């Protein structure tokens, strides 16, 4: 069809409910296109976002009640995704996501005419005048990524690393018996339970975790209200705070609008911390699956004292963990992701931070990948673990680490000889104090108990 | 003085209290000894934390009255800082901080020895035995570190921060009356007052100093009492529990034992996070220390909107130029937190099993972290945010060129009649055009034309 | 259609090309299937590599002499792009990108078949045996990827940047008449002309582009020919070096075996390196970016010493810059795709780097960001920018800064107060010295020359 | 003594050189006064670049034979360390390095003054019109710190990477006959010699110490001459190419005065590019340095085909266990190093207009990384590298389990009289279980399977 404004006539797909605004837009924003489209939890946000808009304005006497009610119709299609495929831009536009809010306005205004009984085009349900009423760019943008975020970290990263805790800690109950080495600086210490050492991994995911969703609260504060630099011109004075409770209703977060609503448009901090935040999670992550490829590492030229599950339904020991590799590639890209956010969240000027579609990307590409390989770590591997208690047992039974208890019963010069045959002869202690008769294979097991090192209290 | 350790004796200077491991570690890891030196903040907690273990193991029985008393006496002679010059060791030693564990419990051991009138080096009172007892370096420095950080950040980073917070307050409260043009996208928007400027950026502060403090609660749980890996191998039962109760005795913030003493070994995710809420904080300041050299640019060729005091001649001078050095000192300091998270981080994701070797370098870059902010923070707030001023002449002269101030006429007098107004008052003033064409007169004019209605419209 | 192995059988779509090895891979490597799909530019070198390494063999007499025609008839038609939708597989795999080479083996191989007259899934040209002869994916991957870095810089990055250094260097040449007031710390300093400023901007992308040039060289040393460890084996001993010799032909660029094939496998210092200077190239960017706007910044409240063009075909002055947004964004974006790429270069552990796939595809996607906002900010903004005459020379007439010619020819009192005048009354200095009557308005034109201080040599 | 500037006069220590300038600037910038004092690096080459100044503008006519003879001398006092004490001035000050120039150009201009007999604050010898004759700091101090990173770099980094490249090429050729079990994806692989694994750690170093010393070249390309913005004004038209060929003959580096001035005040974008080398020459010693300790772990229960020396006690104590120390402090070194190329890359991309006001911190930083990793990488290279010795009992143990050596035997008795020797030898060594299967005699045994053959193949 043919949309017509003061700018002149231009052709949109007969199709594509977006206007003459956003098909320009599509012509000329052209950076990434095939990789950075502008991320569908944005769109969906702020579909939300106007369905609460043209709620507020109609009960505060902003809009026609008939012409508001279609909007909200049409926004809430946006929400549910009906109209995915209408939002064709990508997140290298203006630092304010202008074409974007547009995109949305022009999409929800020509559904709404629609719905209106009103041919595409024809702007009945005006997507400045009516649809973005009393908004801008400027606070709506940051609203919807706000929004955003916060529901994606529900939505898919908080499952997936709650999964990987609930599958660690039932693999550290299940295996909390079996003693093992312990090591510092990678050289053996002292002995453990592969328990302790799988439930140390679920105890960093909570902490970290728990980080996040600490930091999360920083999103609650909107910019909604504060319009173009935040004194909330050309908007009713009580339109951000009914929107904020609608999409507070809505979601079930408790949204509110920013203290502040000039920080709020100059500056993400909140949106800051939480990327980094993320990127610690990530980086217990990295910790955790090495540790994993390490301790699988053979079959006999590593440590090997798990194994892994295959990767496709190669025996047990010399599986590539590949799991993990895929795993800490997403991290690296996180730590960057990360860095992109930071970096552009010092480089707000005066009423407006200009990197708006950037740090949302960024923020909800580290969500999504981190999702994505947290769950795919989790069901190919993880629940997979098992012990290789051949290799276990002959690490620690030949071990000096359990030559403790051995001094206290026979003295230290005895005990230092099990200990230098053992070695030497690369013998267990147990058949070394017996080949020495200081010993027998009974007396041993009632002086030498791995257990009480673990688990000394 | 001939001090020994398991591994032989050696010689240490007879005027210091170290012994054998430090002098070992003094001689082999000469990396950055001029400017990295431990920070004293850890030897100061390591302090805190051997005289709570020495009094914990004395109420446990582990340590005999004598020995233990003098312990905790030579103990609170380091916290108090009598013992700092004894304190000679490198951040870049081991990762686990095993040589500075030993530096403090030599020192502690030989002060000991002396206060039980034992000679130096006698070891009367035991660094690894008595000192040392029932703890690892590979739990105590992890509890040292993040006691010391916690204990900074109230000391020196909370304190600067908050006094900025004032200032900015004050400083928007005065200046609430006065309207200037916004901008976005660094292009002419629409009226605020700088009072809602400055207030921002106080805003800013308060949101990141919320977050530092809320990371800050992850410094409370502890690794003491897992000793070597986490299992608590050598340590009395109750011997973590009550170094964690008398250190939040003594500092008065609540330290517990970690849930997990693995993952506190392995690990220092919370200290990572603690510095991440610090690099905000930064990028917060940066925000706003560009925002301030930016307005109070020029003073004739910029925006100059505000001025700011001169405490120094500068390069070049010109009558009325102020260098913005402040803001450049804080600036500087900014991009090197950033570079500190990185570092932080960085070591963070590399533990491995059941230790992060790493530990130095992560209390170190965020203990540099917090003094340098603390440092230049006081510094922009007492010699340039306290004298922040405006510059009424320039702000007006921008105000009465925004087209929001215009917006009044054209419902006031018609789009033509006033868009007129335009093209008068700027190829000076619109109240003088108004009043040049008759349009209107100077009492009228403001009586239509009301800035502040656009920069307080609700 | 359905192909057959030891590992069974499986589905793949009759029209794809790729066998039950990529089929198994593209239904078990789930994450980021959306935004990162294996780039081209990787594809497209591995079939220059699988096509030189046909040849290779052939000529070492590794190869039949019909089936090696045929591979390398099917490779070249994927490097001239027409097998692109035969690549399913996400960056996210192994980090060996051994699915990848798996994809590529078998892609080239079925095609081959089928010139050789038999139908897809015969193997006759053997994936593994013919195809992947005497290579490893863990030699061939990082070969072609440093190709696909190399030639991605020559067909993308470096046509941009030159092509903006262009642009700045003819309007530096025709502005360089233009006075104006100089800036340091912010500050007004001394005089420059416009086209010593713009031209300061075109001298930092010839030395920054100069050094990513420099550090390209070390994308000339291969991995190629030492297999799976840098060994060797399972290779031709000349394998290596005829291949580095082909892609050299083929590509115009002295490709050759890195002189430890050991490092090369181990690690990807040169990416790093090469990485880092594009990173160096951004900030650069960046500077330049900043220094438009600010200096477009208006119309009234800013600086507005220049005027962009509009962003769609709003008057001179008051155009927002949204072309420095764009910008300014994939900036930060690249500078975190290089904290992904070293953090990943420091990772490797033993004989192989698994983080080749990630460490490839950031570079790649700042290569093409930078390519894409270069050449729209240098079409779009930087070829239109022109100065604000007006504006500029009344900075530079109302400066102190004229003052220097007054002190030598009337005296540093009487020039003192004409510049305490001017600023009292907002008037230049000329008309101070007017109405005093120190000079005439006449006298003052040959008194104070501003070329003379921008040009005091 | 009292001393003056154009704000007025100031107190400074009767015993120290320097001037009002540095009085003030110790006062208001106390930012790190403990451990980031101005780098004498800075200070050392700023008195190279004052000794050429007065060396020019003397051969042009700026300035008399008396004064600039006395400055020359002054001057070269100052390189050779003699007035170290007298720059106590922090690197987080203005961010063009005023302040650090005036301490420069008073502390010569007092010290010239009293070489001619002239009271100290007299100005005989003037800071300003004498010493800082035709210069800026805009331009002078970029181009002192170019030249001290660039003399860093020769005198210590290059030494100590060259010295370890040495170390690990003599070890390589020592252990190339040891034939052991290659790892990818930290799971066995195909055999190689140990030999051919040092070399690869030398080799890294060869590649990433070339990528430093090639974007070294940049900064050769110094600012000097272009004044406060790039026009030269108030210099000599021959100033700054003489001060540069004057430092070139000083140093033996070709330095000249950059193409292009404006953008050598506006960016240093040679510097980042020489940091983001010390970067990637870093993260290869990360993986050198991680390969190291992996290869040393155990002594048992870990890989342990490598054992390294022992230069402490240590935390825990075990028979034969040698905690990898050096490597931890290098790889700490690492992590910092990372830290300081984000900060100097950050402060990079924020120049304004006609200058770049990070340039203490850029060079701060990029020094700081010099001399750490020249530290530690030397520390590594006496205490670690050195004394790296193979465990051939265990490379034998893990070799002789290795498939690769079973595939000989596969297509010399058959696969199924190979693979059964497999399921006997494994769950000790090969060569065994053929003859005790007397499948084959322990001499044909040698002679089917040989190991070296696999790893070097060509």
């Given at each position: 069809?043919?949309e017509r404004d003061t700018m002149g006539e231009v052709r949109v797909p007969?199709?594509?409910?977006?206007?003459?605004?956003?098909?320009?837009?599509?012509?000329?924003?052209?950076?990434?296109?095939?990789?950075?489209?502008?991320?569908?939890?944005?769109?969906?946000?702020?579909?939300?976002?106007?369905?609460?808009?043209?709620?507020?304005?109609?009960?505060?006497?902003?809009?026609?009640?008939?012409?508001?009610?279609?909007?909200?119709?049409?926004?809430?299609?946006?929400?549910?995704?009906?109209?995915?495929?209408?939002?064709?831009?990508?997140?290298?536009?203006?630092?304010?996501?202008?074409?974007?809010?547009?995109?949305?306005?022009?999409?929800?205004?020509?559904?709404?005419?629609?719905?209106?009984?009103?041919?595409?085009?024809?702007?009945?349900?005006?997507?400045?005048?009516?649809?973005?009423?009393?908004?801008?760019?400027?606070?709506?943008?940051?609203?919807?990524?706000?929004?955003?975020?916060?529901?994606?970290?529900?939505?898919?990263?908080?499952?997936?690393?709650?999964?990987?805790?609930?599958?660690?800690?039932?693999?550290?109950?299940?295996?909390?018996?079996?003693?093992?080495?312990?090591?510092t600086h990678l050289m053996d210490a002292v002995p453990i339970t592969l328990?302790?050492?799988?439930?140390?991994?679920?105890?960093?995911?909570?902490?970290?975790?728990?980080?996040?969703?600490?930091?999360?609260?920083?999103?609650?504060?909107?910019?909604?209200?504060?319009?173009?630099?935040?004194?909330?011109?050309?908007?009713?004075?009580?339109?951000?705070?009914?929107?904020?409770?609608?999409?507070?209703?809505?979601?079930?977060?408790?949204?509110?609008?920013?203290?502040?609503?000039?920080?709020?448009?100059?500056?993400?901090?909140?949106?800051?911390?939480?990327?980094?935040?993320?990127?610690?999670?990530?980086?217990?992550?990295?910790?955790?699956?090495?540790?994993?490829?390490?301790?699988?590492?053979?079959?006999?030229?590593?440590?090997?004292?798990?194994?892994?599950?295959?990767?496709?339904?190669?025996?047990?020991?010399?599986?590539?963990?590949?799991?993990?590799?895929?795993?800490?590639?997403?991290?690296?890209?996180?730590?960057?992701?990360?860095?992109?956010?930071?970096?552009?969240?010092?480089?707000?000027?005066?009423?407006?931070?200009?990197?708006?579609?950037?740090?949302?990307?960024?923020?909800?590409?580290?969500?999504?990948?981190?999702?994505?390989?947290?769950?795919?770590?989790?069901?190919?591997?993880?629940?997979?673990?098992?012990?290789?208690?051949?290799?276990?047992?002959?690490?620690?039974?030949?071990?000096?680490?359990?030559?403790?208890?051995?001094?206290?019963?026979?003295?230290?010069?005895?005990?230092?000889?099990?200990?230098?045959?053992?070695?030497?002869?690369?013998?267990?202690?147990?058949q070394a104090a017996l080949e020495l008769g200081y010993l027998t294979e009974?007396?041993?097991?009632?002086?030498?108990?791995?257990?009480?090192?673990?688990?000394?209290?």
């Amino acid at each position: 069809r043919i949309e017509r404004d003061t700018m002149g006539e231009v052709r949109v797909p007969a199709d594509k409910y977006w206007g003459a605004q956003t098909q320009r837009s599509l012509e000329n924003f052209r950076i990434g296109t095939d990789r950075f489209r502008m991320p569908l939890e944005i769109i969906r946000a702020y579909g939300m976002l106007k369905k609460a808009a043209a709620r507020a304005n109609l009960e505060l006497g902003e809009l026609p009640e008939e012409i508001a009610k279609a909007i909200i119709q049409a926004a809430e299609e946006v929400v549910q995704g009906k109209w995915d495929d209408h939002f064709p831009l990508v997140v290298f536009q203006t630092g304010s996501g202008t074409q974007t809010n547009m995109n949305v306005n022009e999409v929800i205004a020509n559904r709404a005419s629609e719905i209106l009984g009103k041919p595409l085009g024809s702007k009945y349900a005006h997507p400045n005048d009516h649809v973005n009423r009393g908004q801008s760019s400027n606070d709506t943008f940051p609203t919807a990524m706000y929004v955003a975020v916060a529901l994606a970290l529900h939505q898919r990263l908080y499952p997936a690393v709650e999964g990987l805790i609930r599958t660690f800690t039932a693999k550290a109950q299940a295996f909390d018996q079996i003693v093992k080495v312990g090591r510092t600086h990678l050289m053996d210490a002292v002995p453990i339970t592969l328990g302790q050492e799988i439930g140390s991994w679920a105890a960093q995911l909570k902490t970290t975790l728990a980080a996040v969703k600490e930091m999360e609260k920083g999103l609650y504060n909107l910019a909604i209200g504060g319009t173009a630099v935040g004194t909330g011109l050309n908007a009713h004075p009580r339109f951000g705070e009914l929107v904020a409770k609608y999409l507070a209703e809505e979601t079930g977060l408790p949204f509110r609008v920013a203290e502040n609503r000039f920080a709020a448009l100059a500056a993400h901090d909140e949106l800051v911390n939480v990327m980094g935040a993320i990127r610690t999670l990530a980086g217990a992550l990295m910790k955790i699956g090495n540790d994993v490829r390490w301790l699988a590492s053979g079959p006999y030229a590593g440590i090997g004292e798990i194994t892994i599950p295959a990767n496709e339904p190669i025996m047990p020991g010399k599986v590539n963990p590949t799991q993990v590799e895929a795993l800490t590639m997403v991290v690296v890209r996180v730590y960057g992701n990360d860095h992109t956010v930071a970096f552009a969240g010092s480089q707000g000027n005066f009423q407006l931070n200009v990197y708006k579609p950037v740090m949302a990307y960024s923020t909800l590409e580290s969500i999504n990948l981190l999702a994505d390989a947290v769950a795919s770590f989790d069901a190919h591997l993880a629940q997979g673990i098992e012990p290789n208690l051949e290799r276990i047992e002959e690490y620690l039974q030949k071990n000096p680490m359990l030559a403790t208890a051995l001094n206290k019963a026979i003295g230290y010069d005895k005990a230092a000889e099990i200990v230098k045959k053992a070695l030497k002869e690369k013998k267990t202690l147990k058949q070394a104090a017996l080949e020495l008769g200081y010993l027998t294979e009974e007396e041993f097991d009632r002086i030498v108990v791995p257990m009480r090192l673990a688990k000394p209290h």
